[PDB]
């Protein structure tokens with residue numbers, strides 16, 4: 001009974017298996033390329049860390065909106081999701097963590113704003129009609145700095161203008177090929193910046209205030225790119 | 228005998244809702260077997276989340292089976308089981324682990340077993 | 347009788363193209379059901395979108411079927427059929443709604459039905 | 466017949482280890498095809514290097530195949546086969562070329578062909 | 584002294600040269616081969632390098648310069664060597680940023696349009712100066 | 714009123730089976746899905762509750778002419794109950810005309826009665 | 838000639854699933870896939886048009902030696918027909934040699950003849 005049914009079912013399952021195998025191989029190759037890009041990026045972040053810590057540390061730190069804690073009335077959240085499904089809990093973990101953090105910290109929509117990277121996050125947030133500010137979708141599978149420079153700079157400018165007082169960012173961290181874990185990081189202000197390898201003697205050729213003015217947005221943009 | 232005027236309106240409605248959820252869960256099985264939970268819509272996630280618990284709560288520990296497992300077993304009334312299933316359907320126990328619903332009766336035993344497990 | 351020397355080279359080409367597009371559509375019906383429409387390539391999305399139009403346009407309103415359809419019925423010549431199918435294959439009517447191609451007759455009726463639907 | 470009650474504990478251990486190494490090499494085929502021979506850990510490279518030697522040493526030149534190749538062919542005793550496979554497993558001949566392990570019957574013919582090659 | 588340029592997309596390298604000539608808001612700026620360490624931001628300009636006999640000139644944008652008696656670095660958002668002028672695309676970029684200035688709140692706003700024009704003109708002109 | 718209902722319902726079943734495989738849905742597909750869900754809700758019926766054809770035609774007309782497009786899918790049963798109760802008092806001449814001539818009444822009266830019932834109808 | 842044809846056709850059959858992406862190595866997803874599509878086109882045939890064995894060998898030789906790698910896939914079936922008539926005008930010594938000795942001609946002679954035809958062929 002249902003012999004034709006079973007045969008058709010078997011054929012469909014075989015074709016599905018082949019398609020999924022091909023997708024797995026493609027994913028492996030693209031993961032290797034992504035690791036290569038991260039390895040390329042690392043030294044720039046290292047040097048930026050060194051310069052930022054050396055300049056900020058000491059009596060010359062003084063005060064700056066991106067450097068010192070403003071009074072907190074609002075909070076910005078930057079969430080990074082994918083554009084294509086079939087990735088497992090990669091989006092669910094981030095979205096659930098962000099939802100629970102928002103529900104614990106705030107009660108009114110005016111207390112927070114959301115910046116979403118990814119097509120998945122848009123639908124999740126607008127299903128509940130949560131606040132949304134700006135978005136970018138359909139990035140290349142191997143993004144470059146030019147693809148997100150504008151959005152990172154716009155977010156930094158929004159922080160500078162006082163649109164919101166503190167900025168948080170959530171993303172999945174690639175600990176290993178089997179496990180990926182979500183993390184929360186604080187971008188602005190640059191609180192709890194640890195010490196450098198050694199205190200510097202860099203003479204502030206322009207005013208160190210102008211040094212900070214130039215340096216801080218680039219630091220935030222680099223952090224966004226690394227995440 | 229499963230008629231509204233023979234068992235009562237509340238009993239009839241509870242039974243129909245349970246059967247509907249179980250039917251939907253049975254429909255989802257083929258997709259679950261391949262893509263897992265990760266591709267289901269938000270509503271179907273809740274449907275599975277509740278169907279698992281309802282299915283487990285349908286089990287019971289018999290008096291006769293005491294010679295097989297050593298558990299004393301229990302006897303539950305119709306009103307008690309209807310109230311328990313209505314509470315489960317309303318979503319009052321979505322925070323409990325599914326293993327707490329297994330092989331017990333009277334729903335208070337579900338709560339006690341979850342507490343013993345450490346919830 | 348489906349030979350180039352009997353029906354015409356253009357007729358044969360249109361028939362073969364329709365058959366191969368429908369065959370290609372038939373193969374995707376299994377993987378689509380559990381991998382979604384998005385995971386297909388851009389060209390395969392196009393062939394699916396055009397094959398739906400072909401399949402829905404292959405239907406016709408019969409004079410006899412007035413009882414079952416509520417419509418008078420239509421009669422269409424081979425030249426109109428082949429020209430319309432060639433246009434659908436070439437994509438001149440990809441914008442029209444999917445539901446507008448069924449039980450129509452000519453592509454003039456297709457576009458009139460789409461216009462009456464508000465497109 | 467592949468049980469310690471018949472062939473002996475040494476034979477059984479050698480056979481089991483050879484099969485395990487071959488299965489590991491079979492598993493590594495996908496990653497080898499994707500990322501190439503590189504992008505491999507130490508154990509991956511070592512197991513591939515030993516498994517290729519084992520797989521080639523499984524080959525043998527038959528007396529009948531003389532009509533095809535001209536080689537006389539050989540009758541390899543089971544004792545010699547087991548000893549040679551154990552020696553290859555231990556890694557003694559890790560430096561010999563791959564093609565030296567092909568179609569040469571007993572173990573000493575492998576080193577003889579390697580010496581003839583260089 | 585050794586000069587290196589680092590870009591987030593990838594480092595762009597150069598060997599040891601005698602002197603480095605750079606422009607900055609500080610004004611007339613020029614490093615020493617054994618200079619005391621300091622920091623100095625850079626605008627959209629070109630960094631002039633001079634090895635013994637042969638000299639090289641590299642474009643830069645969003646630069647942050649650090650110096651040390653051993654190493655000299657340019658934390659560059661974008662840096663292109665002398666041979667990598669890409670004059671024709673930069674020529675289009677000059678026009679591409681030209682209308683954006685004259686367009687009120689264009690698709691890419693003034694916060695890049697202002698910077699694009701000064702970037703495009705340098706990429707068009709300041710290179711190939713060897 | 715209902716010559717095309719079976720074909721439309723079969724098409725809706727096929728469309729629900731297909732479009733379940735994707736969230737990016739078109740406006741026409743959304744409208745068809747809503748109409749199909751409402752029709753399926755309408756067709757439900759209890760046990761030993763016969764309904765005269767003069768009321769079946771009215772409810773199916775109200776469904777197919779778009780007067781049910783805004784009621785939530787969970788309220789259609791109560792909507793139909795209230796509609797029958799309201800027809801038992803107002804619009805009795807509509808039932809008389811349908812029963813006598815076996816044809817639809819003037820379409821203006823249908824619209825007026827349906828709107829009058831909808832104004833007093835309240836969403837739960 | 839036919840020995841290599843079996844390999845390429847099998848590999849294309851083996852790697853059919855990857856035809857959608859085209860996002861991997863040139864060999865893995867471009868070289869084999871492009872060659873396999875060419876092979877399927879050549880093996881096509883019409884009704885009641887038997888081909889002499891001498892002409893079959895040459896056209897398979899052209900594919901297996903990489904002389905069709907620049908022609909678009911849609912243009913392969915037309916390339917075959919014109920190649921046969923070209924042989925009747927300039928490859929008579931080539932066709933005769935295969936007939937008389939049942940062996941492939943000198944590769945240098947046939948390479949120029951194949952290459953010469955590609956010059957007169959116009960891409961569709």
Ligand SMILES: Nc1ncnc2c1ncn2[C@@H]1O[C@H](COP(=O)(O)OP(=O)(O)OP(=O)(O)O)[C@@H](O)[C@H]1O
Pocket residue numbers: 146149592644660661662663667668669670672673676679699702703706
């Ligand atoms: N003509 C060019 N000259 C130099 N670098 C270029 C050129 N075109 C692209 N690039 C490089 O491409 C990357 C992205 O360019 P960037 O973000 O600086 O903006 P842009 O090229 O001015 O943009 P637009 O596309 O608006 O012209 C940088 O690494 C930059 O060096």
